[PDB]
Amino acid sequence: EPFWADLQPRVAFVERGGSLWLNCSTNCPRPERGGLETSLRRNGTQRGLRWLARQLVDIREPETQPVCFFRCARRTLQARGLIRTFQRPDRVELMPLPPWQPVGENFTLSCRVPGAGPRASLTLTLLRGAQELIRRSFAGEPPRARGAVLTATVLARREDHGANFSCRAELDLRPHGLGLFENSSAPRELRTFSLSPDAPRLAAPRLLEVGSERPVSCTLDGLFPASEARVYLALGDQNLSPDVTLEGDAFVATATATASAEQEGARQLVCNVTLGGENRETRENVTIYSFPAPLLTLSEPSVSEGQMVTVTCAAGAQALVTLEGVPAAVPGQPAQLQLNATENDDRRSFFCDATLDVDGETLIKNRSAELRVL
Ligand SMILES: *[C@@H]1O[C@H](CO)[C@@H](O[C@@H]2O[C@H](CO)[C@@H](O[C@@H]3O[C@H](CO)[C@@H](O)[C@H](O)[C@@H]3O)[C@H](O)[C@H]2NC(C)=O)[C@H](O)[C@H]1NC(C)=O
Ligand SMILES: *[C@@H]1O[C@H](CO)[C@@H](O[C@@H]2O[C@H](CO)[C@@H](O[C@@H]3O[C@H](CO)[C@@H](O)[C@H](O)[C@@H]3O)[C@H](O)[C@H]2NC(C)=O)[C@H](O)[C@H]1NC(C)=O
Ligand SMILES: *[C@@H]1O[C@H](CO)[C@@H](O[C@@H]2O[C@H](CO)[C@@H](O)[C@H](O)[C@H]2NC(C)=O)[C@H](O)[C@H]1NC(C)=O
Ligand SMILES: *[C@@H]1O[C@H](CO)[C@@H](O[C@@H]2O[C@H](CO)[C@@H](O)[C@H](O)[C@H]2NC(C)=O)[C@H](O)[C@H]1NC(C)=O
Ligand SMILES: *[C@@H]1O[C@H](CO)[C@@H](O[C@@H]2O[C@H](CO)[C@@H](O)[C@H](O)[C@H]2NC(C)=O)[C@H](O)[C@H]1NC(C)=O
Ligand SMILES: *[C@@H]1O[C@H](CO)[C@@H](O)[C@H](O)[C@H]1NC(C)=O
Ligand SMILES: *[C@@H]1O[C@H](CO)[C@@H](O)[C@H](O)[C@H]1NC(C)=O
Ligand SMILES: *[C@@H]1O[C@H](CO)[C@@H](O)[C@H](O)[C@H]1NC(C)=O
């Protein structure tokens, strides 16, 4: 039985910044020299015959090898040991995914667990809801190195809208006799959208008569989420309130649009829809007209018989006026038809036609009035 040196514990696993006791002993009856050699710290100490104890506090190093040495009978007697540290995955961070992610396009997922060690004992897993997307074990990494990073790129889908993404960090110390420490990051909700480059189809009449209700409709296709989409449809600068329903992935905006006049002779119909960070618009110009139908009025209601009269129309100097088939003569006016009253002319209808062209389209309206002859 020769002389020996013994320190306890031989190998010790202690949390980073923690503390532990080392008492180094020997069988030498009267050692001339003894002490503990390490790089870390001292808090308090307990010694005596054949053994000394040191309190190593605040351990900031991944791996250290404390050596306790003794001297008896002018010989060097030493003992070596091992102290390693770990760090819980207390801080786990997930990157701030884009506000709106296009459906059918890839996006990055990166879980970040800084400071956690040892790296080889870290198992990182990306989670969508309760489902595991990917599992990456870092086993085979240097024991000295800490921290872990897991990056994976997945495909944005339809269901991915309103779905939670997180990352689970597992530090497995179990084979070392300590245990398993796992902590999950903050779940992040994703919002996905798909907006077709196609322009919305707008159904509108070319001409709009004042005081008449002409229905208009603005629709599109392939919009998700459909309910999330906001739609504006109006007449010129005058706001409207379209009834909006949802047929499939398509929205249907339908309402009746009246005319005022107001202003002026022509305008545009504006329909635009903002979904997420993108928006589409279709503008169909529409000419607006007012039709002042000519008057059938007479110079005088009676006029017996034999006295001439002057008949007027007044389409408003726009349309070409024809009163009972006469191309008046002269234009820009309710131009006159001069007729001497006759008994045979009793109750004769005057046909007044007004031909007005707007935006290249011709419109006419007709009626008749009579005159009594005494
Ligand atoms: C989603 O992201 C992944 C990863 O960035 C990409 O998918 C990859 O797209 C490329 C382009 O077609 C391909 O990668 C490689 O293609 C060559 C042939 O050109 C082949 O020899 C390689 O083995 C590899 O497949 C491939 O389609 C695909 N690769 C994988 C592993 O998925 C792309 O950015 C996105 N995928 C889409 C949009 O489908
Ligand atoms: C996915 O994760 C998100 C958070 O990133 C979860 O949202 C959270 O849960 C619900 C919304 O579904 C909210 O519930 C709250 O309940 C309490 C008690 O009833 C009430 O006082 C609150 O006013 C609210 O209604 C909660 O606020 C919300 N948290 C945040 C920050 O928005 C979502 O639930 C997860 N998905 C699933 C399927 O669980
Ligand atoms: C470090 O080791 C020494 C080895 O001597 C321990 O001292 C012994 O303590 C036991 C207690 O069960 C006694 O029975 C022995 O008689 C002690 N040895 C001697 C030589 O007196 C010491 O206690 C250990 N340190 C700690 C903190 O336990
Ligand atoms: C390090 O020294 C501190 C004193 O600065 C020791 O603290 C004593 O013991 C416990 C543990 O912190 C405290 O609750 C007591 O109040 C402290 N005693 C006194 C008299 O102050 C501590 O034990 C030492 N060791 C470690 C590992 O911290
Ligand atoms: C949705 O419609 C509204 C109508 O009020 C648009 O508002 C104007 O649109 C023009 C052309 O896009 C802009 O130049 C003006 O600055 C807007 N002014 C106001 C007060 O909104 C709106 O722009 C349309 N949305 C999109 C994305 O075009
Ligand atoms: C889990 O990680 C979060 C990340 O911020 C941290 O705030 C929390 O203290 C951790 N919990 C435990 C028990 O480690
Ligand atoms: C509609 O009118 C606008 C002017 O307001 C004009 O720029 C545009 O070309 C017109 N549309 C067509 C198809 O001509
Ligand atoms: C006027 O005559 C045209 C052509 O005969 C006809 O289409 C139209 O209905 C008539 N107007 C009225 C109010 O009946």
Count the residues in the chain.
374
- Residues within 6 Å of ligand 7 by CB: 268, 285
* Amino acid in the structure at residue 293: A
Grouping H, G, I as helix, E, B as strand and the rest as coil, residue 194 is strand
Distance 164 CA to ligand 2 centre (A): 11
- Taking a C-beta distance cutoff of 8 angstroms, is the pair 165, 126 a contact? yes
For ligand 3, whether the C-beta of 7 sits within 6 Å is no
CB atoms within 10 A of CB 123: 20
Residue among 202, 237, 269, 285 to mutate when testing ligand 7 (max atoms within 8 A of CB): 285
Distance 353 CA to ligand 1 centre (A): 72
For ligand 2, whether the C-beta of 189 sits within 6 Å is yes
- Which atom of ligand 6 is least distant from the CA of 181? 14
Distance 187 CA to ligand 2 centre (A): 11
With 0-12 CB in 10 A as exposed, 13-18 as middle and 19+ as buried, what is 179?
A: exposed
CB atoms within 10 A of CB 321: 25
For ligand 5, whether the C-beta of 196 sits within 6 Å is no
Resolution in angstroms, to 1 decimal, for this deposition?
Answer: 3.7
φ, ψ dihedrals at 108, nearest 5°: -90, 145
Distance 63 CA to ligand 3 centre (A): 27
For ligand 2, whether the C-beta of 164 sits within 6 Å is yes
CB atoms within 10 A of CB 32: 11
Grouping H, G, I as helix, E, B as strand and the rest as coil, residue 5 is strand
Distance 40 CA to ligand 4 centre (A): 17
Residues 55/60/65/70 CA torsion (nearest 10 deg): -30
Taking the CA atoms of the chain, what radius of gyration do you get in angstroms?
A: 48
Q: How many helices (H) and strands (E) does the chain have?
A: 0, 36
Ligand lying nearest the CA atom of residue 363: 8
DSSP codes, 80-112: E-EEEEEB-----EE----SSEETTSEEEEEEE
Distance 178 CA to ligand 4 centre (A): 24
How remote is the C-alpha of 362 from its chain's centroid?
48
* CB burial string 139-167: b at 16+ within 10 A, e below: eebeeeebbbebeeeeebeeebbebebbb
Please name the residue whose Cα sits nearest to atom 23 of ligand 3: 23
Please name the residue whose Cα sits nearest to atom 4 of ligand 7: 285
Q: What is the Cα–Cα distance from 285 to 299, expressed in whole angstroms?
A: 43
* CB burial string 62-79: b at 16+ within 10 A, e below: bebebebbbbbeeeebeb
DSSP codes, 113-172: ETT-B-GGGEEEEEEETTEEEEEEE-TTS-TT---EEEEEEEE--STTTTEEEEEEEEEE
After which residues does the chain become discontinuous at a C–N distance over 2.5 Å?
A: none
- Which atom of ligand 1 is least distant from the CA of 104? 38
Cα–Cα distances (Å) from 369 to 314, 329, 330, 347, 374, in that order, read 14, 21, 22, 9, 17
Question: Topology of 89-197 in CATH?
Answer: Immunoglobulin-like (2.60.40)
CATH of 1-88 given 3.40.30.10, 2.60.40.10, 3.60.40.10, 2.40.50.140: 2.60.40.10
- Taking a C-beta distance cutoff of 8 angstroms, is the pair 65, 81 a contact? yes
* Amino acid in the structure at residue 265: G
Residue among 159, 166, 189 to mutate when testing ligand 2 (max atoms within 8 A of CB): 189
Q: What is the Cα–Cα distance from 302 to 295, expressed in whole angstroms?
A: 18
Q: What is the Cα–Cα distance from 158 to 161, expressed in whole angstroms?
A: 6
* Amino acid in the structure at residue 326: V
Q: What is the Cα–Cα distance from 161 to 200, expressed in whole angstroms?
A: 24
Does the domain made of 291-374 have the CATH classification 1.20.1250.20? no
The bridge status of strand 19-26 relative to strand 11-15 is: unpaired
- The structure's method of determination equals X-ray
Q: What angle do CA 217, 266, 357 make, to 5 degrees?
A: 100
DSSP 8-class letter at 43: S
φ, ψ dihedrals at 119, nearest 5°: -60, -40
Q: What is the Cα–Cα distance from 31 to 217, expressed in whole angstroms?
A: 103
- Taking a C-beta distance cutoff of 8 angstroms, is the pair 326, 337 a contact? yes
89-197 and 291-374 share one fold: yes
CATH of 198-290 given 3.30.70.380, 3.40.50.720, 2.60.40.10, 3.30.70.260: 2.60.40.10
- Which atom of ligand 2 is least distant from the CA of 188? 5
How do the domains of the chain map onto residue ranges? 1-88, 89-197, 198-290, 291-374
Closest CA to 293 of 243, 368, 361: 368
Ligand lying nearest the CA atom of residue 282: 5
Ligand lying nearest the CA atom of residue 166: 2
Grouping H, G, I as helix, E, B as strand and the rest as coil, residue 343 is helix
- At 157, list the tokens: 């889908």
Q: What is the Cα–Cα distance from 97 to 41, expressed in whole angstroms?
A: 44
For ligand 6, whether the C-beta of 201 sits within 6 Å is no
- At 240, list the tokens: 């409207």
